[PDB]
Design a protein around this ligand. Structure first.
Ligand SMILES: C#C[C@]1(O)CC[C@H]2[C@@H]3CCC4=CC(=O)CC[C@@H]4[C@H]3CC[C@@]21CC
Length: 247
């Protein structure tokens, strides 16, 4: 309608809701395994999605692969925030329609602590009242929010691609926002993205530790998920990548 074309395209390429396949007898092991399964399924959707994402397929194949493997985590927790904020007013973590967790289902300490950290996103969503339009644009920026220390092969086309999406976000902010109020809401939304780097870092550490101890904890990791983890997680944890900040 009165909504910009690219934002409309972004909405059309958003995947259908993904189920985890959970049963429900939730042990910590059966819960983590279900979360890795849902992740495996989300990874597939991310990749298929990036192929319709305007501008993405025009970057080097190496670059497409690097950006995906660098951002899967941030993307999955950011979309967790949306679903949570949208279906249960952000007061419950809506991983999937068959895997929604309240405070009672988070028995183990470390696990409840991880959840409390992810919960910050849907809480900001409820607070700033993030829009469907703003969300879609921000999700794309996250895909383009970290690059190799030495840069990307198609760096120029990447920088041009990222600017279009920053301009697109401003368009979505202009849908509801004034000059100072719009300029202020821009500061707010790009600061939120900035704060995700630090947020995703804790999820990474918890993930790699759970992966490395997958035998003991009896927690299974699928093939595609095991690959991105093994291929990029350690490097990222060691801070051997370049985070793109707005502030
Ligand atoms: C529990 C656990 C973890 O190990 C640490 C952070 C976690 C992820 C955080 C975000 C996420 C949102 C979803 O909607 C699908 C499952 C995924 C998660 C699966 C399990 C992880 C990554 C493998």
């Amino acid at each position: 309608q009165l909504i910009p074309p690219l934002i409309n395209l972004l909405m059309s390429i958003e995947p259908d809701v993904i189920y985890a396949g959970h049963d429900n007898p939730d042990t910590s092991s059966s819960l983590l395994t279900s979360l890795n399964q849902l992740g495996e399924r989300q990874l597939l959707s991310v990749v298929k999605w990036s192929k319709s994402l305007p501008g993405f397929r025009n970057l080097h194949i190496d670059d497409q692969i690097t950006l995906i493997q660098y951002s899967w985590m941030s993307l999955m927790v950011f979309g967790l925030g949306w679903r949570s904020y949208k279906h249960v007013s952000g007061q419950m973590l809506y991983f999937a329609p068959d895997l929604i967790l309240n405070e009672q289902r988070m028995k183990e300490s470390s696990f409840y602590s991880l959840c409390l950290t992810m919960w910050q996103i849907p809480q900001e969503f409820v607070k700033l009242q993030v829009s469907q339009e703003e969300f879609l644009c921000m999700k794309v920026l996250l895909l383009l929010n970290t690059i190799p220390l030495e840069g990307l092969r198609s760096q120029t086309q990447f920088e041009e691609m990222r600017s279009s999406y920053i301009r697109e976000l401003i368009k979505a902010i202009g849908l509801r926002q004034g000059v100072v109020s719009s300029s202020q809401r821009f500061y707010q939304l790009t600061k939120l993205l900035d704060n995700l780097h630090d947020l995703v870092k804790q999820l990474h550490l918890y993930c790699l530790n759970t992966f490395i101890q997958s035998r003991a904890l009896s927690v299974e990791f699928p093939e595609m998920m095991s690959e991105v983890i093994a291929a990029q997680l350690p490097k990222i944890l060691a801070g051997m990548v370049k985070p793109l900040l707005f502030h």
